[PDB]
Amino acid sequence: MQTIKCVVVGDGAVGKTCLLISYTTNKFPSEYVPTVFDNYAVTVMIGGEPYTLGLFDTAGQEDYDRLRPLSYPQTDVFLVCFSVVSPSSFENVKEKWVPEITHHCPKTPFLLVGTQIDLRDDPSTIEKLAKNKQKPITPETAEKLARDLKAVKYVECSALTQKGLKNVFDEAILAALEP
Amino acid sequence: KKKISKADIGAPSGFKHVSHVGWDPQNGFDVNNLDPDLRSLFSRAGISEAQLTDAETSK
Ligand SMILES: Nc1nc2c(ncn2[C@@H]2O[C@H](COP(=O)(O)OP(=O)(O)CP(=O)(O)O)[C@@H](O)[C@H]2O)c(=O)[nH]1
Ligand SMILES: [Mg+2]
């Protein structure tokens, strides 16, 4: 019985909670109050066998720094979900999101999750801030970081529509694990 | 070998609610199934404002 230690890391609003749910529940939630701690275990067919995927949801804040690392010890890979429609995250993503982990485990795999597609496909907002101060991130720009931070791979995902949703977790586990 | 491939990890199917933490600005955390090991780390971490007494144990 093998199990992966997929923990979602990140500080900000990159729809990291809803993407986690729809992934395992294949459905979009409704209630609003999921940012604290939620451990989910999935059963995927890996290597021709029903493997287990240890999903650990963080708080993505500073006030919960006390019970935050609690999900770090038993970890293999890391899910760095950064908002594509927010340069801010991108900047820290390379100098804040991964580093925070490197200080603890600079060898463990690093999944580069790209969330906030629904908005990324909303020129109304993209163009709105595109010339005010903000701007969306291109796959080529995210990739580079995926390599700049020794990230196992760069993959975006959604929840409402599930656009490449699970496809991302498929890259995570694949990374958390090894030959 | 233990090499996973993009085509290996099939489609998920086994949602296991290992732990559920429901915060509330009026009740303050509504955890009713936290993890065993985390149970000690949670009450010791940010949930150390008071031991777990949510409803007395049913005799
Ligand atoms: N349309 C759509 N809405 C989404 C999707 N994912 C999340 N949302 C919505 O965005 C809002 C915030 O989602 P949430 O996952 O809590 O954001 P967060 O990045 O975790 C924010 P925080 O760091 O404060 O906890 C919610 O209203 C949720 O319904 C998605 O794939 N599509
Ligand atoms: Mg959240």
Swiss-Prot record, chain A:
Notes on activation and inhibition: Regulated by guanine nucleotide exchange factors (GEFs) which promote the exchange of bound GDP for free GTP, GTPase activating proteins (GAPs) which increase the GTP hydrolysis activity, and GDP dissociation inhibitors which inhibit the dissociation of the nucleotide from the GTPase.
Keywords for the protein's UniProt record, in alphabetical order: Cell membrane, Cell projection, Cytoplasm, Cytoskeleton, Differentiation, Disease variant, Glycoprotein, GTP-binding, Hydrolase, Intellectual disability, Lipoprotein, Membrane, Methylation, Neurogenesis, Nucleotide-binding, Phosphoprotein, Prenylation
Main location: membrane
Phosphotyrosine, modified sites: Y64
Motif (Effector region): 32-40
PTM notes: (Microbial infection) AMPylation at Tyr-32 and Thr-35 are mediated by bacterial enzymes in case of infection by H.somnus and V.parahaemolyticus, respectively. AMPylation occurs in the effector region and leads to inactivation of the GTPase activity by preventing the interaction with downstream effectors, thereby inhibiting actin assembly in infected cells. It is unclear whether some human enzyme mediates AMPylation; FICD has such ability in vitro but additional experiments remain to be done to confirm results in vivo.
(Microbial infection) O-AMP-threonine sites (modified residues): T35
List of residues binding GTP: 10-17, 57-61, 115-118
EC id: 3.6.5.2
Record PTM (Microbial infection) O-AMP-tyrosine, positions in chain: Y32
Membrane topology: Lipid-anchor
GO cellular component: apical part of cell; cell-cell junction; centrosome; cytoplasm; cytoplasmic ribonucleoprotein granule; cytosol; dendrite; endoplasmic reticulum membrane
InterPro entries registered for this protein in UniProt: Cdc42, P-loop_NTPase, Small_GTP-bd, Small_GTPase, Small_GTPase_Rho
Glycosylation sites: Y32, T35
One GO biological process term: positive regulation of cell growth
Subunit structure: Interacts with CDC42EP1, CDC42EP2, CDC42EP3, CDC42EP4, CDC42EP5, CDC42SE1, CDC42SE2, PARD6A, PARD6B and PARD6G (in a GTP-dependent manner). Interacts with activated CSPG4 and with BAIAP2. Interacts with activated CSPG4 and with BAIAP2. Interacts with DOCK11/Zizimin2; the interaction activates CDC42 by exchanging GDP for GTP. Interacts with DOCK9; the interaction activates CDC42 by exchanging GDP for GTP. Interacts with DOCK8 (via DHR-2 domain); the interaction activates CDC42 by exchanging GDP for GTP. Interacts with IQGAP1. Interacts with NET1 and ARHGAP33/TCGAP.
Name this polypeptide is given: Cell division control protein 42 homolog
Organism field: Homo sapiens (Human)
Curated annotation (Swiss-Prot), chain B:
Tissue expression notes: Expressed predominantly in the thymus. Also found, to a much lesser extent, in the spleen.
Record's subcellular location: Cytoplasm, Cytoskeleton; Nucleus
Domain CRIB: residue ranges: 9-22
Domain of life: Eukaryota
Annotated function: Effector protein for Rho-type GTPases that regulates actin filament reorganization via its interaction with the Arp2/3 complex. Important for efficient actin polymerization. Possible regulator of lymphocyte and platelet function. Mediates actin filament reorganization and the formation of actin pedestals upon infection by pathogenic bacteria. In addition to its role in the cytoplasmic cytoskeleton, also promotes actin polymerization in the nucleus, thereby regulating gene transcription and repair of damaged DNA.
Disorder cited: Wiskott-Aldrich syndrome: An X-linked recessive immunodeficiency characterized by eczema, thrombocytopenia, recurrent infections, and bloody diarrhea. Death usually occurs before age 10.
Domain comment, as recorded: The WH1 (Wasp homology 1) domain may bind a Pro-rich ligand.
Oligomeric and partner information: Binds the Arp2/3 complex. Interacts with CDC42, RAC, NCK, HCK, FYN, SRC kinase FGR, BTK, ABL1, PSTPIP1, WIP, and to the p85 subunit of PLC-gamma. Interacts (via C-terminus) with ALDOA. Interacts with NCK1 (via SH3 domains). Interacts with FCHSD2. (Microbial infection) Interacts with E.coli effector protein EspF(U).
Protein name: Actin nucleation-promoting factor WAS
First-to-last residue of the parent protein present: 230 to 288 of 502
